[PDB]
From a paper:
Cobalamin-independent methionine synthase (MetE) catalyzes the transfer of a methyl group from methyltetrahydrofolate to L-homocysteine (Hcy) without using an intermediate methyl carrier. Crystallographic analyses of MetE from T. maritima reveal an unusual dual-barrel structure in which the active site lies between the tops of the two (βα)8 barrels. The fold of the N-terminal barrel confirms that it has evolved from the C-terminal polypeptide by gene duplication; comparisons of the barrels provide an intriguing example of homologous domain evolution in which binding sites are obliterated. The C-terminal barrel incorporates the zinc ion that binds and activates Hcy.
Author numbering: 0 to 733
């Protein structure tokens, strides 16, 4: 007998019933009772999928917005600004709106959770959702195992007075209080017949201190009387011996995202007093795997149970209807539903109920050797630009002829309903390619003339022809496919369809030349080429695992550099490369950052390997650069734009303290997440702060980030104020 587990199955539904329910309810289209009924249908669909494939059925997974927020509500962590917790009304206020909790990435994934704000030192059982869901399924004659976020990870993902609660001394006191509530929840479950509880502790894979583990041991000793099964994923646990010594009867390890868990288990063994649950089916990638190979790992480990490595919600629901993928790709893929079926196959095989498993091997599939070696024989010169910054700077400035404190923007422009409809009609084939392009040309012209009128120094074409930055390029690159319904939850009701890098990546034709060249033909002002970095493209896409990550990254980077070269040839003087994944794609373990940044840096530089006369702008809307400034410094950009409104310019500290910093900085002086129009005085405070140490010639003035989420009536007046401010600064520091 091989007990099979599974967790994190997508909640959105095959027809995206979840997204529609949430949105209809918010718009007032349906009632709370109707919203609930729809959610229960999804609940049944989920456990139905589980029941057909695995032995242990999870419950408490259908979150109405975020499971971390659900955990906070469970323990009473509701900020005072929300008043008494009413229910859904309060829940969504904490989730979205002007008073909502901060939203941030869940570990190193594309799912975003809500950051609990701990205002009190005493937790209490506000709502027992785990019990609620457990009883709901029991009433349907279905035994389930509540899926909950463990107490250590919960605090680890939370903040107290604006700071993370991550040091042992910051966690210790709160934990005793927190575990007491968990104890109450667990006791009630057991009293009601609950046989197993799935506790998620992914924080165990962070670079923890031995002091953290001392705290964790004490936490679980207090919960040793409950039927707990602890899961860890996204990487190897930070202290194997300490982890396996925890007083829990069942322990799960992710044997997919890392090799350390296995090596450590082979070297130190695994306790006889507890059972191992082998996470052997990947939840982060959509590739079919040779179940005979997986089977051998499980057999060597003598593991009594199996399951996916990490939550399945990082994958789309089903591959079933994906019948328009490039030839041969569909047969090598497997989404959430198929991953569950793989666990069933593995279970049956391991129990001798079957003696055969489908063969899986496609190493040569979609592999373009000529392009591969083009990257494998990479000579240093493709990673370092011809001349050093100081020399390039001299050449660029004489070429650009820009004033002190030049102004520009750094992203998309707002998209009217008309722009959206045209893109729609185009995708549906309602209109021709020539027709769509003509429309785009019109929007670009209007945008260019508007910037001219407003008085900006460096212009952008608006990107009215793009929706998702990564999808835009994925559709133009060979080796990358896009799905029709491969939806994956990002947060709340927001879903995205990750592209699939299934083979060697190359750029067959120019991807952005027509729009950029056209925009530039309308003005004497320099117009920016706008591209997305290599690491960002793969960060938002699924990709082959039988090739090192850095190779895929360099392949993409080379393709991007070809675009850069075509832009240069076309006379484009400035090229911006947005690489938000530079930090966002970094390992959860900062101890693994050296190896990661080595190639992330090389990938960007390969993509940005432009002629000395070509000004390269790197763009990243990070809230702080203190922990990565040393890596940033190795990127061969000429200008780097940052968001400085939130910190009122204090984010500049990482730059003024970097000895030898001499590159230009595009200072964001306007928060594009607010409809409010920044006053000239507000922006002035920011620029003045930035000018405290750094020389004035390094500074550019621009908005914080893209503008596509704002309306024109907000953008125009803010842009004019930005120009007015820059003009003022020039007179002052003339
Ligand atoms: O160390 C992991 C931390 O930086 C966050 O990604 C957790 O969500």
């Amino acid at each position: 007998f091989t007990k099979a587990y599974a967790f994190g199955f997508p909640k959105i539904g095959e027809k995206r019933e979840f997204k529609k329910a949430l949105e209809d309810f918010w718009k007032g289209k349906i009632t709370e009772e109707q919203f609930e009924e729809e959610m229960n249908k999804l609940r049944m669909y989920m456990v139905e999928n589980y029941r057909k494939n695995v032995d242990v059925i999870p419950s408490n997974e259908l979150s109405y917005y975020d499971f971390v927020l659900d955990t906070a509500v469970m323990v009473g962590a509701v900020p005072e600004r929300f008043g008494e917790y009413r229910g859904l009304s309060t829940y969504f206020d904490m989730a979205r709106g002007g008073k909502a909790l901060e939203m941030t990435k869940f570990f190193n994934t594309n799912y975003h959770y809500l950051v609990p704000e701990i205002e009190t030192e005493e937790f209490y059982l506000l709502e027992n959702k785990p019990l609620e869901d457990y009883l709901f399924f029991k009433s349907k004659g279905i035994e389930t195992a509540p899926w909950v976020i463990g107490p250590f990870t919960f605090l680890y993902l939370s903040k107290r007075n604006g700071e993370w609660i991550r040091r042992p001394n910051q966690m210790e006191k709160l934990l005793e209080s927190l575990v007491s509530v968990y104890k109450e929840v667990f006791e009630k479950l057991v009293e009601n017949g609950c046989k197993e509880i799935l506790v998620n502790e992914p924080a165990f894979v962070c670079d923890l201190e031995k002091a953290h583990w001392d705290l964790i041991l004490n936490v679980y000793r207090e919960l040793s009387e409950f039927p707990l099964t602890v899961f860890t994923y996204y990487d190897s646990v930070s202290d194997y011996e300490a982890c396996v010594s925890l007083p829990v009867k069942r322990l799960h390890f992710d044997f997919v995202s890392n090799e350390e868990n296995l090596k450590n288990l082979e070297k130190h063994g695994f306790p006889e007093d507890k059972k191992l649950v082998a996470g052997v089916i990947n939840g982060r990638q959509p590739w079919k795997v040779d179940l005979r190979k997986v089977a051998s790992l499980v057999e060597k480990l003598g593991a009594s149970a199996i399951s996916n490595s990490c939550p399945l919600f990082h994958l789309p629901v089903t591959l079933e209807l994906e019948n328009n993928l490039p030839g041969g790709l569909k047969e090598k893929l497997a989404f959430a539903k198929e991953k569950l079926e793989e666990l069933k196959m593995l279970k049956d095989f391991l129990e001798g109920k079957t003696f055969d498993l489908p063969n899986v091997s496609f190493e040569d599939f979609a592999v373009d050797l000529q392009a591969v070696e083009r990257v494998r024989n990479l000579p240093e010169d493709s990673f370092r630009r011809e001349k050093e910054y100081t020399e390039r700077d001299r050449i660029q400035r004489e070429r650009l002829n820009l004033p002190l404190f030049p102004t520009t923007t750094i992203g998309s422009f707002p998209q009217t309903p008309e722009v959206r409809k045209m893109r729609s009609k185009y995708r549906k084939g309602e209109i021709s390619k020539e027709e769509y392009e003509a429309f785009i040309k019109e929007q670009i012209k209007k945008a260019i003339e508007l910037q001219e009128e407003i008085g900006l120094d460096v212009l952008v074409h608006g990107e009215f022809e793009r929706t998702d930055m990564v999808e835009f390029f994925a559709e133009k690159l060979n080796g990358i496919a896009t799905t029709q319904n491969g939806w994956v939850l990002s947060y709340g009701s927001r879903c995205y369809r990750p592209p699939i890098i299934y083979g060697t990546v190359t750029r067959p034709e120019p991807m952005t030349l027509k729009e950029i060249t056209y925009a530039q033909s309308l003005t004497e002002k320099p117009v920016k080429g706008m591209l997305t970095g290599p690491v960002t493209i793969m960060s938002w896409s699924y990709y082959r695992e039988d090739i090192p990550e850095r190779e895929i990254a360099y392949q993409i980077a080379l393709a991007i550099n070809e675009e850069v070269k075509d832009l240069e040839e076309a006379g484009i003087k400035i090229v911006q490369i947005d690489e938000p994944a530079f930090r966002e794609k970094a390992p959860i373990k900062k101890s693994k950052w050296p190896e990661y940044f080595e190639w992330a840096i090389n990938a960007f530089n390969l993509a940005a390997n432009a002629r000395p006369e070509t000004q390269i702008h790197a763009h990243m809307c990070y809230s702080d650069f203190n922990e990565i400034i040393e890596y940033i410094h190795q990127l061969e950009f000429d200008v780097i734009s940052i968001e400085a409104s939130r910190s009122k310019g204090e984010i500049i500290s990482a730059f003024e303290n970097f000895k030898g910093w001499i590159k230009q900085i595009g200072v964001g002086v306007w928060d594009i997440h607010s409809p409010a129009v920044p006053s000239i005085n507000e922006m002035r405070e920011i620029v003045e702060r930035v000018l405290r140490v750094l020389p004035k010639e390094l500074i550019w003035i621009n908005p914080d980030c893209g503008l596509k989420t704002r309306n024109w009536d907000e953008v125009i007046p803010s842009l004019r104020n930005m120009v007015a401010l820059a003009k003022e600064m020039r007179e002052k520091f003339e």
